[PDB]
């Protein structure tokens, strides 16, 4: 009601020039919510407009903000140059503690340290952050971005302690207080304990906090897929998460992580035809949610629509996050039953195993898929020499893993003594292989006799050549 009319007046004056000076400033001043390129263009001619009436250097608040724009753009380097020349122009504001160029330099340095984090120049990011905190320790965001940086290293660092002292300096601070429990998301065994550490600022001054209450829904959904649903316990959990999701539904129709949660809990309720629709909505809403890519393909493989699923899996792999995400290739290799769903499935398992050789489940699953391809080549086959020669080696390897996993105690909370019936299988597969390798020698000897048969007749055609020559 004040912003659309602002847009109208701004494009009432942008084409005009009644000595427009700041007209681009209050153009872009609303454009930062909107398209960023419009703000860039406004700053572009605004940089010029301060030069012709008098050759006046651009105040550093402009230059810091245009670097801030380029931060969310690809123009990271000249964003850095903007922050440098911003700090210089603030230094050129030598006497302006009324305007508090020092404070402007403080937030400019904050932006530049956030930029060094985008360079992954965490060393200089540390430098700028500790320069500000040693001079303004009352500030919190620098106090926790440092904590976030060590969170990238890990949880029980001074990451967690900068985070807790950020609450010590400001316990009213909802962002840091949320980040406290965000740390505790790593410890999922601290699942039911997160009620308390996400209750502390359920004081109604902080309420409504959509972010935290969705976090309650998420820590409440990770409770699911347990064998206690038949005991009505996870049914109550499903309906409780549903109640949270109804609450966030009514207070916000346009949240999308909510609708992802509703679709997830009803998919856990077994309504997968009733799930692809609700996920389709958030799909057009924004594709750039990593979760919905997975949850749609779970439905697809639930209709066994692999040729619709694995492509969107690797589409989720198109983010610059991790070259072998583990659960994605797990959720890829589910009912994969065709040829590339077997051998290239093995290749995917090898890619996962390369960075994750610790997993018992993964070495079980490679043994499983090797078993499948071994029984695919020895039963109605009547197949090549070399591949059935590889078959005995690969099933021997599979038996090595059958033995190896069975000696290990801990499993995925389901003991894998199931390798034992695989061991009887692979023994009878040894018998079948000894059957079929004889057939391999038979096909070798008959191909020898037929090549002798072509040798003799081509000798005969040279004989006809000799008759025509004479």
């Amino acid at each position: 009601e004040k912003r659309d009319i602002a847009k109208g007046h701004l494009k009432k004056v942008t084409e005009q020039y009644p000595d427009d000076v700041e007209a681009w400033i209050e153009l872009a001043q609303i454009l930062e919510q909107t398209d960023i390129q419009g703000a860039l263009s406004a700053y572009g001619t605004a940089t010029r407009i301060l030069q012709e009436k008098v050759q006046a250097d651009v105040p550093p608040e402009i230059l810091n903000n245009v670097g801030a724009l380029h931060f969310r753009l690809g123009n990271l380097g000249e964003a850095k140059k903007y922050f440098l020349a911003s700090l210089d122009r603030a230094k050129a504001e030598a006497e302006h503690d009324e305007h508090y160029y020092n404070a402007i330099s403080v937030t400019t340095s904050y932006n530049l340290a956030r930029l060094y984090e985008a360079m992954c120049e965490f060393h200089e990011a540390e430098k700028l952050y500790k320069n500000i905190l040693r001079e303004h320790p009352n500030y919190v965001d620098c106090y926790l971005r440092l904590g976030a940086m060590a969170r990238d290293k890990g949880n029980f660092y001074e990451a967690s302690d900068w985070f807790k002292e950020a609450l010590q300096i400001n316990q009213d601070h909802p962002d840091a207080w949320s980040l406290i429990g965000n740390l505790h998301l790593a410890k999922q065994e601290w699942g039911p304990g997160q009620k308390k550490f996400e209750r502390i600022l359920k004081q109604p001054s902080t309420q409504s906090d959509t972010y935290s209450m969705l976090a309650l829904g998420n820590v409440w959904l990770q409770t699911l897929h347990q064998p206690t649903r038949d005991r009505e316990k996870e049914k109550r959990h499903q309906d409780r998460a549903l109640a949270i999701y109804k609450q966030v539904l009514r207070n916000d129709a346009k949240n999308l992580y909510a609708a992802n949660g509703i679709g997830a809990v009803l998919a856990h309720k077994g309504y997968f035809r009733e799930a692809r629709d609700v996920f389709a909505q958030v799909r057009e809403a924004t594709a750039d949610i990593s979760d919905v890519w997975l949850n749609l393909a779970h439905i697809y493989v639930e209709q066994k629509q692999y040729i619709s699923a694995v492509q969107m899996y690797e589409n989720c792999l198109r983010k610059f996050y991790k070259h072998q995400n583990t659960e994605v290739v797990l959720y890829l290799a589910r009912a994969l039953f065709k040829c590339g769903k077997l051998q290239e499935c093995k290749q995917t398992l090898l890619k996962a195993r390369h960075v994750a050789p610790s997993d018992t489940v993964l070495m079980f699953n490679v043994a499983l898929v090797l078993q499948r391809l071994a029984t695919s080549v020895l039963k109605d086959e009547k197949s090549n020499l070399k591949e059935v020669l590889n078959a005995v080696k690969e099933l021997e390897l599979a038996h090595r893993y059958f033995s190896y996993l069975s000696k290990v105690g801990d499993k995925m909370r389901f003991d894998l003594a199931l390798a034992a019936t695989e061991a009887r299988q692979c023994s009878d597969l040894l018998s079948q292989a000894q059957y079929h390798v004889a057939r391999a020698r038979k096909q070798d000897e008959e191909e020898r006799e037929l090549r002798a048969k072509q040798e003799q007749e081509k000798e005969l055609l040279r004989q006809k050549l000799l008759k025509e020559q004479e």
Binding site: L221, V265, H268, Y331
Partner: peptide, 25 residues
Amino acid sequence: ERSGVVCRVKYCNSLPDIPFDPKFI
């Protein structure tokens, strides 16, 4: 074969963290 590949199938849901957009004076 007799049964499919084993998984702890979950319809999980992730959260974005705090953005910290560079500030606008």
